[PDB]
Amino acid sequence: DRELAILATAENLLEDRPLADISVDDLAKGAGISRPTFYFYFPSKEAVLLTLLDRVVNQADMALQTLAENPADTDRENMWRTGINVFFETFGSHKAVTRAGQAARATSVEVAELWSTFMQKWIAYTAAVIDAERDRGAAPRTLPAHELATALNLMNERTLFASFAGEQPSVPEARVLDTLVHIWVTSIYGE
Amino acid sequence: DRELAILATAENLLEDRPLADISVDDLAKGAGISRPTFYFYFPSKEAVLLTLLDRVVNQADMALQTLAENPADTDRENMWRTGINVFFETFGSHKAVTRAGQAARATSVEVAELWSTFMQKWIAYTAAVIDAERDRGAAPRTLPAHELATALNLMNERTLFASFAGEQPSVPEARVLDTLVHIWVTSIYGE
Numbered sequence: 001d002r003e004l005a006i007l008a009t010a011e012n013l014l015e016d017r018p019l020a021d022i023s024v025d026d027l028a029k030g031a032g033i034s035r036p037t038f039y040f041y042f043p044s045k046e047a048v049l050l051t052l053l054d055r056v057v058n059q060a061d062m063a064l065q066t067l068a069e070n071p072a073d074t075d076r077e078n079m080w081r082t083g084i085n086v087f088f089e090t091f092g093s094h095k096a097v098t099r100a101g102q103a104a105r106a107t108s109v110e111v112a113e114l115w116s117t118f119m120q121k122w123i124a125y126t127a128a129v130i131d132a133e134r135d136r137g138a139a140p141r142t143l144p145a146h147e148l149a150t151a152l153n154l155m156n157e158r159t160l161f162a163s164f165a166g167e168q169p170s171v172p173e174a175r176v177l178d179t180l181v182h183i184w185v186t187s188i189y190g191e
Numbered sequence: 192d193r194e195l196a197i198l199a200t201a202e203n204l205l206e207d208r209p210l211a212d213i214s215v216d217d218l219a220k221g222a223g224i225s226r227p228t229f230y231f232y233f234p235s236k237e238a239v240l241l242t243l244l245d246r247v248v249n250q251a252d253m254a255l256q257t258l259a260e261n262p263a264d265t266d267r268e269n270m271w272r273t274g275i276n277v278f279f280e281t282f283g284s285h286k287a288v289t290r291a292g293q294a295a296r297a298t299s300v301e302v303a304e305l306w307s308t309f310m311q312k313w314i315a316y317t318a319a320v321i322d323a324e325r326d327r328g329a330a331p332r333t334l335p336a337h338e339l340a341t342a343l344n345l346m347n348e349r350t351l352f353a354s355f356a357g358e359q360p361s362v363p364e365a366r367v368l369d370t371l372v373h374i375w376v377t378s379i380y381g382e
């Protein structure tokens with residue numbers, strides 16, 4: 001509807017400017033509506049960002065769910081790679097939303113709780129996979145699985161973000177997936 | 192001087208409130224001076240934070256330098272643990288400055304460049320140690336050492352921060368050092 005035009009306008013404008021440099025008038029103009037009509041679809045520009053981020057986060061979540069139900073016929077290293085690649089490709093395809101969404105964590109309770117809920121879910125799933133690998137004898141019982149899963153997921157969040165943002169320092173985007181896979185596989189399977 | 196009283200006041204107030212909830216008048220009062228006298232020592236409350244953070248960052252840097260020149264007579268795992276412990280104990284003893292300092296990265300060019308410079312230095316040193324371990328045959332040649340060092344240092348920054356802040360999710364502070372050491376040692380020495 002007009003809602004999709006507002007969202008697409010916001011995502012396009014976030015390529016160039018921070019959210020503080022975008023006005024409600026800018027979003028309405030880009031969507032072909034008046035300022036009061038905008039407020040019928042969203043209560044604020046922050047709510048537009050929250051919706052964009054919610055869509056990106058659930059896109060990753062659903063893709064990870066799909067992988068879980070369709071295990072790829074390949075070795076263990078490639079199975080972890082395909083999982084991390086979900087986050088690499090989903091957030092990497094929406095870099096401006098990812099950037100603005102992490103910035104809004106500091107100021108928005110709703111954004112911070114969205115990130116935290118989905119991080120908790122992904123950590124719990126990671127820990128359950130580690131636990132399953134230990135039970136079948138494929139991985140050694142080293143660190144508590146949930147603590148290991150927490151640090152590896154936090155590593156991914158920080159490292160992918162730095163790569164996408166081109167921060168200094170960062171791992172080049174063309175190298176970050178293999179870097180993370182190496183650290184995940186050695187720390188999960190290494191004695 | 193009066194400068195130390197301003198700094199100590201700011202660090203005490205940051206335990207309770209964010210920097211946006213602290214006024215120049217608050218710092219001057221706590222230091223026993225007037226507002227115009229404050230501006231003789233610092234141009235802004237942001238400059239007070241920058242100085243606090245610069246002191247914490249150089250405290251860690253100097254401690255790491257000291258360790259480098261006095262290698263401990265212990266095994267490799269404990270040597271890495273003693274190095275990571277520098278960051279665990281230095282920033283962990285100044286949690287309010289660490290919290291406010293990371294928040295200011297978004298808004299202050301000087302704060303962002305302070306963090307980046309010292310992260311680059313620590314990554315380079317980590318990579319040189321990895322390279323030395325590979326040359327003496329103690330570590331396998333897997334990932335490029337500088338890429339591995341980048342991701343492990345970014346992991347530490349994010350994971351220690353979450354632990355200190357009590358974020359959800361996070362590794363409990365009493366467990367985070369052993370968690371990070373495990374990931375560093377397995378990813379550096381694991382084939």
Ligand SMILES: CNCc1ccc(N2CCCN(C(=O)CCC3CCCC3)C2)cc1
Pocket residue numbers: 080083084087088091098102118119122123125126152153154156157158160161
């Ligand atoms: C901040 N940049 C965007 C961003 C990039 C990555 C992440 N991540 C943290 C949450 C889960 N995550 C992961 O590393 C999950 C790996 C999957 C989970 C199960 C098997 C393999 C990536 C979160 C945000």
Ligand SMILES: CNCc1ccc(N2CCCN(C(=O)CCC3CCCC3)C2)cc1
Pocket residue numbers: 271274275278279282289293309310313314316317343344345347348349351352
């Ligand atoms: C954000 N929380 C405070 C904070 C905590 C940790 C860090 N770190 C990132 C920079 C270097 N760092 C490290 O993990 C360095 C490990 C040392 C370097 C050489 C041998 C072992 C910790 C940076 C900031």
